[PDB]
Amino acid sequence: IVGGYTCGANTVPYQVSLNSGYHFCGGSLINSQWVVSAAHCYKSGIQVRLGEDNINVVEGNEQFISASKSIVHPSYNSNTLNNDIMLIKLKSAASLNSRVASISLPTSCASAGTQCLISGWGNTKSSGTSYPDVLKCLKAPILSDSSCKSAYPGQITSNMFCAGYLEGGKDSCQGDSGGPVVCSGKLQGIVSWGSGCAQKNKPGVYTKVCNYVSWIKQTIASN
Ligand SMILES: COc1cccc(CN)c1
Ligand SMILES: [Ca+2]
Numbered sequence: 399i400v401g402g403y404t405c406g407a408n409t410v411p412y413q414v415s416l417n418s419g420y421h422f423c424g425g426s427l428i429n430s431q432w433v434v435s436a437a438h439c440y441k442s443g444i445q446v447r448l449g450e451d452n453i454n455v456v457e458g459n460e461q462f463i464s465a466s467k468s469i470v471h472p473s474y475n476s477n478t479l480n481n482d483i484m485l486i487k488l489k490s491a492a493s494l495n496s497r498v499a500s501i502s503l504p505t506s507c508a509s510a511g512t513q514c515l516i517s518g519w520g521n522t523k524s525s526g527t528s529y530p531d532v533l534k535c536l537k538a539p540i541l542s543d544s545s546c547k548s549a550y551p552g553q554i555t556s557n558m559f560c561a562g563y564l565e566g567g568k569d570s571c572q573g574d575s576g577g578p579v580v581c582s583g584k585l586q587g588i589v590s591w592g593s594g595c596a597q598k599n600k601p602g603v604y605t606k607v608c609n610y611v612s613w614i615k616q617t618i619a620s621n
Contacts, residue, residue, distance in 0.1 A: 399517065399530075399534035399536050399569075399574055400521070400523065400568060400569050400570075400596040401524075401536070401567045401596055402535050402568065404530075404534060404535070405517060407451035407532070407533075408496075410515070410517045410535065411496065411497050411498055411499035412426050412428075412500060412501035412580075413426065413533060413577065414427055414446050414447060414448050415453050416433075416445075416446060417444070417445045418443050421447075421519055422441070422573070423435055423436065423575045423576035423577070424518040424519070424520075424577025425577065426501050426578040426580075426585050426588070427492065427498070427500050427501065428501060428614070429500050430491035431488050431491045433486040433487075434485060434607070434614065435483075435484050435576035435577075436484060436576035436590055437471055437481065438476065438482055438575065438590070438591075439484060439575055440468060440470050444465040444486060445462055446462070446464070446465060447461075447462050448460065448462075448498045449461055451532050452532050453519055453531060453532075459497045459498070461492050463492060467486075468487075469484060469485040469487075469621065471484065479558075479590055480558075482558075482588065482591070482605045483605050483607070485614065485617055485618070485621075501578065501580060501584070501585045502583060502585065503584065503585060503611050504585065504586055504611065505584070505611075507608035508581045508584070508586040510539075510541060510542040511542075512586075513539055514538055514539070514540060514579050514586060514587070515535060515538075515579070515580045515581075516561065516562075516570050516574070516578070516579050516589065517534065517574075518589060519531075519533060519573055520534075520573030520575070520577075521572045521573055521574075521595065524594070524595050524596035524597065529573060536562075536569075538561045538563065538568065538602075539562075540560070540581070541559070541561060541562070541564070543559070546558070546559060546560035546603070549599050549600060550593070550600075550603065554603070556606070556609070557605060557609050558604065558605065558606055559587065559603070559604050559606050560601045560603055561579060562601035562602045564598070566596045566599075567596050569592065569595045569596040569597075570592070570602045576588060576589060577589045586604075586608060587605060588605035589604060590603050590605045591603045
């Protein structure tokens with residue numbers, strides 16, 4: 399997260415870190431056994447880390463649970479990043495509490511102008527590289543489909559939305575990938591892509607989660 403703020407330990411209780419020897423992506427806990435992330439975060443040997451603030455220090459609220467399976471969306475295209483969503487099942491159910499909690503799926507799609515919370519352990523620099531140890535947060539509005547399409551000609555599908563600031567300075571970045579965009583207590587987006595970070599007229603692009611609720615529910619019900 400570039401130009402954000404320190405969230406505060408365990409203030410974003412649905413935020414997970416995906417770890418394969420190191421943090422490589424964010425995710426969102428959607429029930430005791432399932433995490434939603436980006437399909438571009440797919441790899442084998444994933445351990446889901448819940449209750450994290452400082453990802454380099456065991457602070458006492460963590461649960462570390464290995465993934466038993468990953469399910470990338472059947473229509474995910476890695477070139478265009480269309481359908482950039484993946485489900486991860488935990489080998490055992492997380493113990494839910496005030497600091498490890500699921501986030502609700504949307505019942506409706508959020509509109510342009512809606513204020514949301516984007517969070518993660520990604521790069522905090524727009525030019526350099528600096529990775530934080532503690533969770534960073536950014537309040538950001540959803541941008542209109544037209545401004546999103548104008549920012550990225552030929553690249554925005556019906557399964558994507560832009561959020562952030564056309565002036566730059568405040569954005570998600572590398573390592574925030576797969577993490578949440580939450581608006582009014584619903585998971586509306588997944589950190590998906592962009593051109594660099596916090597650059598003028600190049601806002602973050604997010605997977606439009608409301609399009610996938612049926613798939614998520616069906617998949618969970620049979621797996
Ligand atoms: C350039 O790599 C990125 C990864 C995740 C999110 C974004 C959006 N600035 C960019
Ligand atoms: Ca920790």
